[model samples]
Target: GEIYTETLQQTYAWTAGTNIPIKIPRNNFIRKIRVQLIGSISNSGTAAVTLPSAPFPYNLVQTFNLSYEGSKTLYSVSGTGLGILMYYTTKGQNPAYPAPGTSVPASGSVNLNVMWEFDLARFPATMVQNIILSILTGQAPSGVSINASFYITITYERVTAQEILSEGGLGADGEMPLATVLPKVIEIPTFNVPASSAPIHVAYLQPGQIYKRQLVYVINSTSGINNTDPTEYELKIVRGVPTDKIKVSWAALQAENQAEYQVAPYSGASAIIDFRKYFNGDLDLTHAPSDSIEYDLALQNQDNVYSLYVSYVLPYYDQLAAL
Candidate 1:
């Protein structure tokens, strides 16, 4: 356990599509890395569902992407999805949100922040380059503004050249082992569910890798005004050749995510989303080397159409073939 930690921080005035880089130390074996995203949301309009919009912080995070590259793209995903994985694994609490149309305590608007962490010691020499985190602030909800920033802390262990060579870190052919774990977050764009009940299958695009567990969540794009209907659907995960692995109701899934989120008050008596259930709701899973995991869905709203937001994370291990 000969490890120590180092942190790197940076702040920006919130510009859209700008890439912010965080450098890594090349001399140490990185054990783990944690990235924290911090910002606040503001709205100039007083519409009942003002500024940062429905899904709160996720809505803000959906506008950003975090990535790392060495010989190629090693990891990439929306900050929102990555943060959810971090929360599930670590159960870390995020800052509470301010009710819609109101300002955050001592700030211009609601507070928006999230964190993502993962282990890298298994293949420490792969990512000695910089990682980029960027936000598409230009696509932010109308009238909304954010002051986004990031902080990264990496935990590293020291190992001498002899130790590394003895462990096969370097080879005579000038090829070091290029095996490691990476993350993939997919946002399966908003789609229609028609006015009926039949299982709709959405396939994930994955190839040539071994995956561990995955996390899934579907958002009711129908979080309407004065119509609280979060339990109008059912969903399940299918992996195979194709078979039902696990099933859960939309309402129940939301409750699970709600149970894990930090408790706080974001809205008053009648609002559909309170701070507690607001950035909540996700399912944990066991994975394998199948074609890809599929989301099986069925809607129960009679003769009424609905739209939903689907997102999931696939954490996998990659072992490049040796020459």
Candidate 2:
């Protein structure tokens, strides 16, 4: 399968008030959607992107403010905002920020923009040749005139009809498969777990999806906090009742580097608990949407505001019908 890349540029003037439609070929396996912004405008308005379509929707980017100069874009140096959405290693090995490119020249010589890359391949089922994106730019902040240009570079692989058929388990008779791994990423904003209180319900299973736990990261953004770490929290997932608790502590859940896989473990406030690697297919539990995954704090530390980054190998074949 040969990989291909396409770059499309769109510029919205001060008077434009319509959606920015970014089109992609139908039925191809998209790998990445790398976005770059270069403009001379106030960081006020919002850019809300709805990927694939509204019906079978995925809110790719939600109300990202027009902060082209801020460090909160996809690649924030502080690792506080959207930068913490993805994994990072030790604090010392920060990536060197690249200068904004000249593909779409800015109004002046100022290069106050940012670049963000989304790895769509992580959720393969959603990237199968999705159609147009209707990015709603709700009216720019009052008194702020617009002169922004968005450069979207799409990298995708050409998949044959047979490939889709086989992946969806239709190789024999061209029928839909019973299930396929639909990976999902869920981000829990920074919140404080009441000290020694009831367990905070974090996540639950969805009706149409099977809840196969994969990775869970409990992040303590601010370091040097007294008695605030993963060891202080306990993670548990139950099918429907508390008696069936599948539990592990946040500290014990941290993933260790495998000899076979050379990937580096995230080493800061981030903690990656790879259940698939630890349980090895034993805890593949299915439940109704009411079955909850929760976290409980052992000590009473109001200073610790931990955020959760969880992923599941959720299996659902419904997304394929829309393709």
Candidate 3:
């Protein structure tokens, strides 16, 4: 939805001996109209006039109470010449406050200009749209006309939001079942992998040449999980090596290691293994192979892998703790 930020204004002028013809269409109804006269009358005793509804039927003239200064005055006129007096009265002639003729001075032949303002909000949207369109098209209704040089101006935009996820490609293969856990992790900062990174790695170590890892997964579901939920997991390294020399690998540990200690089955609903104090690293292995994951050991002491591993876990831990 949007808002209207512009206002519309119009003006007209009347001459002493000529009549002003205004063509207002039925569809362009006005919510409010203000008329102002800015010139003198024809004679000192003559008043300015407003045409009444005599030429047509009385019903044709729409009459309403008008307010001037602090008093209410009755005003009527036919479709022909209607008079409105603006001469000074005797009430103004007192010693303390002289009358207009005595103190303010009187004039003849009015050269007044009139202005009209309207509120379009009260009208139906369709009707308002039509009136705006007509104004822009320079086709104002039947009775309304530009009595003199006048100015008219009008002013209106459209709204859209940016968090939509899709699952039609290879990257989306596991997005559904993973969605179920989203609520549990939504608020967890540790789970919030950078958008640039994919296939985040969470793993537990086993004894032997082979290694085992737990891959944190994502998915979509009909469940009510939203983007505000919290989900987090812990990773223990158990082995500390320089960041530059540390070798990371993911696979079913060899039978010997598996026999020594049974590997926990992966399950979202159950906590099968505990490495509360083990050392671990959080890596964005987004492009890691689904079948086997591995990292090469390069140099020791240059950038300790052990330190990197622990540093990564700290942020995730802090995020989970906050959640």
In order, what is each prediction's RMSD in angstroms? 7.9, 10.9, 34.7
In the predicted model 1, the residue pairs found to clash are 104-109, 257-281
Looking at model 2, the pairs that clash are: 27-129, 28-129
Query: What's the true lDDT of residue 172 in model 3?
Result: 26
Candidate 1 worst ten-residue window by lDDT: 264-273
Superposed model 2: Cα runs more than 4 Å off: 11-27, 37-82, 89-115, 122-150, 165-180, 189-192, 197-231, 239-269, 282-289, 298-300, 303-323
Give one digit per residue, the lDDT tens place, for model 1 in 281-304. Answer: 432233344445554455443222
TM-score of each: 0.60, 0.52, 0.18
Give the best candidate by lDDT. 1
lDDT by residue (tens digit), candidate 3, 123-168: 2122212122111112211222222332333222111111112311
The alpha-carbon lDDT assigned to residue 247 of candidate 1 equals 54
For candidate 1, what is the TM-score?
Answer: 0.60
The parts of candidate 1 lying over 4 Å away from their true place are: 21-27, 39-54, 63-71, 96-113, 118-144, 162-174, 182-190, 193-196, 224-242, 247-293, 300-323
lDDT of 2 by residue, 215-273 (tens): 33333333322223444334565655564244454444443422222334343233444
Between candidates 1 and 2, name the one with more favorable TM-score: 1
